[PDB]
Amino acid sequence: EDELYRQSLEIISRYLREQATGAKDTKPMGRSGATSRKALETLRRVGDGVQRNHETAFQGMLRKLDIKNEDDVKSLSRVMIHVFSDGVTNWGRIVTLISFGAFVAKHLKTINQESCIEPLAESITDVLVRTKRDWLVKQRGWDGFVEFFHVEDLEG
Ligand SMILES: C[C@@H]1CCCC[C@H](O)[C@@H]2CC[C@H]2CN2C[C@@]3(CCCc4cc(Cl)ccc43)COc3ccc(cc32)C(=O)NS1(=O)=O
């Protein structure tokens, strides 16, 4: 019924799990599957670049956060609200939010805390959707995300 939340959670959870495990989830998407598929494909293309372009800053922040367990992962919501929500919103900042989430998810895999990845994805989704719904709706949601990052085919 809250379709934006459900769709956001599915896209973000899939990207974080895919980043952590290195395998695609072959299960069908829920509702709005065509857009969700394209959003995940976009998030791959763009987020993978973001994590490399900001490698030094990402590594620095990860080290600072010292994520070891469920309690540490739970504390991240407050930090996301502080850093992401309290600023002007644009798609770039949303991708950085999600891309750093994937960076944290990979870290969780490396320390054998894979069970924390889904709660992490839920926390990121809560912060994004519950603090930026108005902006997301005005920007056409995940359809807008896909449109914004669409790259035209090169001739020849
Ligand atoms: C140009 C900027 C990107 C480069 C700067 C990156 C920055 O130095 C920190 C390295 C992690 C970045 C801090 N966080 C990361 C943070 C804040 C730290 C905790 C956290 C945890 C998770 Cl699971 C996901 C995100 C986050 C909030 O999300 C951010 C959203 C936008 C920007 C930065 C955010 C953010 O600053 N995005 S931006 O304006 O596009």
From Swiss-Prot:
Q: Where is this cross-link: Glycyl lysine isopeptide (Lys-Gly) (interchain with G-Cter in ubiquitin)?
A: K24, K27
Give the record's PTM text.
Cleaved by CASP3 during apoptosis.
Effect listed in the UniProt record for changing K38R: No effect on ubiquitination
The induction annotation reads: Expression increases early during phorbol ester-induced differentiation along the monocyte/macrophage pathway in myeloid leukemia cell line ML-1. Rapidly up-regulated by CSF2 in ML-1 cells. Up-regulated by heat shock-induced differentiation. Expression increases early during retinoic acid-induced differentiation.
Q: Where is this motif: BH2?
A: 134-149
Motif window: BH3: 39-53
Quaternary arrangement and interactors, per the entry? Interacts with HIF3A (via C-terminus domain). Interacts with BAD, BOK, BIK and BMF. Interacts with PMAIP1. Interacts with BBC3. Isoform 1 interacts with BAX, BAK1 and TPT1. Heterodimer of isoform 1 and isoform 2. Homodimers of isoform 1 or isoform 2 are not detected. Isoform 2 does not interact with pro-apoptotic BCL2-related proteins. Interacts with RTL10/BOP. Interacts with BCL2L11; may sequester BCL2L11 to prevent its pro-apoptotic activity. Interacts with GIMAP5 and HSPA8/HSC70; the interaction between HSPA8 and MCL1 is impaired in the absence of GIMAP5.
The Swiss-Prot or TrEMBL record describes its family as follows:
Belongs to the Bcl-2 family.
Q: What is this protein called?
A: Induced myeloid leukemia cell differentiation protein Mcl-1
Record the organism: Homo sapiens (Human)
- Shown chain mapped onto the complete sequence: 171 to 326 of 350
